[model samples]
Structures are given as structure tokens and as C-alpha cells.
Target: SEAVKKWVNKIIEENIIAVFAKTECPYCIKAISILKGYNLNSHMHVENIEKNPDMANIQAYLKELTGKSSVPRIFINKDVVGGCDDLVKENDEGKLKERLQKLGLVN
Candidate 1:
């Protein structure tokens, strides 16, 4: 299970946008809904890290890569974008689309 989870998270880094979250995490739900509203899919990969502690690989990767472990951690073009609240803030200020576009998630 650990190996599988690690592999999945590894591949997730290939996406333009990746969201690490747990099921029923209110922030996670809201974050996904916001992304959907922007018509951005495929580039975004969201996983329920709570249900699977094995997903801890993502946390480790974040720390090693960015020195942080906060979820729901978001990545745009493999760059750390902080947590759910950060995502919401970016979306609210209209910066989310611009960032996603730079990552080429939007046309």
C-alpha cells in the first residue's frame, strides 16, 4: 500500500496542478469545487490523503522540496501554493486563473 501510494504521488507531480486533501475535509471540497468552476480538469489531481496515511509521501515530498507539510497543499507547475485557504484566497482575488493559466491549465 505504501509503495502504491508513493508511486501515485510521484506521478501526481507531473500535473500542472495537484491538490492533496482528505475526504470530507471542508476546505478540500471547496477547493475542488472552485477549480471545477474554472473549467480546469486533468491538470488538477486531488487525492484524499487522510484516508490513506500512506499518502504521507506527498507530505514528505513537500517538506523536502519546499520545507512545509500543510494540507490541502496545492501545486502549480510543481511549485507549492500553500493550503486550501490559500487556494481560496487566490481564487477570490482572481489570481487563481492567472496562475493556472501560467501553468497552462487554462487557455
Candidate 2:
């Protein structure tokens, strides 16, 4: 548990964009695809739940950080941006682009 929290903290601090995701999750795929479309995929640090042996501990750590237990918990500039549905909604509303622009990830 302490290890998971430490790792999560390190990841959040090191990456400008981070996504706690499940490798096989459909929402994860969709979220990754959307980031790819913006050429921001490479900037994201993704923690695949399936690959982590301490999946439950990682999820609990993430929930503590984002207040959500769902996969594809995304963060931008270390700020919680919610999950896949929230990402899609922001994209659809054109707010995602604005956020990206503010971050200098997009022109």
C-alpha cells in the first residue's frame, strides 16, 4: 500500500499528463485514442492496471488521489481531469482543445 502510493505520487509528479488505466478496458482505449489524436499520447504516462501485480492497492491509491475508482483516471498538469466519459465530454464540447492550448500542448 505504501509502495503503491509512493509510485503513484512519483508518477504524478514526473508526468505532465498521467492516466491510470486498465490495458483491456474499452474506456482506456478510447481515452488513449483521443490523446493520440491530439499528438499528446506520448506525453502521457499510463499505468496499466493489468500489468501491476498490486492492482487493488494501485486502485485504492488512485481513488485517494482522484476520488474515483474507475480506470482511465486522467490528470492534466497534475490536476484531476476525471475519467474517460469526462474526457470525451470535454472533447465534444471543445473544452479539451482549450485546455490543451492552455498547456501549450496544442496550437
Candidate 3:
């Protein structure tokens, strides 16, 4: 029963940034775009849950992990970064770049 959950944790452990999104979700698209715009050494890591038959199951785990069962559940260095609007707010407030740098992301 925990296979997908284990897989999710492994994905998070292996990547510098992990994004759980649905292919058709606009907010997910925006969040992914924002992540791709970064000049960090690591590239974007996205899991398009729409392609999985276990989409709803995966989202249930997201609610448990991040307290939200929404698209664009973003994680940075294994920590939750919240949803698309949260990221937009963070970046817009000029609070993301330095935070990224502090996390040793920039070159």
C-alpha cells in the first residue's frame, strides 16, 4: 500500500527540487515555469500526476505531507515550498533569490 508513498519519498530524496503537478493545471504550469526560470545548478524535477492512474492516491499523500491536496505541491531540498501562488508571492516579494542562494543553489 505504501509503494507509491515510498517512491514519492525516494524522488524527493534524490532531487534538489521536486514538484507534484497535474499536466493540465494552469497553476502547476506557472509554478513549473517559475522553477525553470531559475539559474541554479540543478534543473526542474516535475512529476505530472495526471499521467498516473494513481493520481488521486498520490494527491492524498500530498495532503498528508504538505497539508494540501492541490496541484503544484512544490518541495525544495526536501521541504515544502507550498503551491504556485505561494511561490509567485515569494518570488514577487524579492524573497526567493536570496533564499535560493542561502540554500547553496546558485553558482
Candidate achieving the largest lDDT: 2
TM-scores for every candidate against the unseen true structure:
0.74, 0.91, 0.89
Q: RMSD, each candidate, Å? A: 3.1, 1.2, 1.6
Scanning candidate 3 in windows of ten residues, the lowest lDDT window is 35-44
lDDT of 2 by residue, 1-107 (tens): 67778888888888888888886899898998898899996688888876879888888878888898889889888888889999999999999999999999999
TM-score of 1: 0.74
Error of 3 at 27 (Å): 0.9
lDDT of each: 0.72, 0.87, 0.83
Model 1 ranges with Cα > 4 A deviation: 1-9, 53-57
How are the candidates ranked when ordered by lDDT, highest leading? Answer: 2, 3, 1
Name the runs in model 2 displaced over 4 angstroms.
none
Clashes of each: 0, 0, 0
For model 2, give the 10-residue run with minimal summed lDDT.
41-50
Rank by TM-score, highest first: 2, 3, 1
Q: Tell me model 2's lDDT, rounded to 2 decimals.
A: 0.87
Deviation of model 2 at 104, angstroms: 0.8
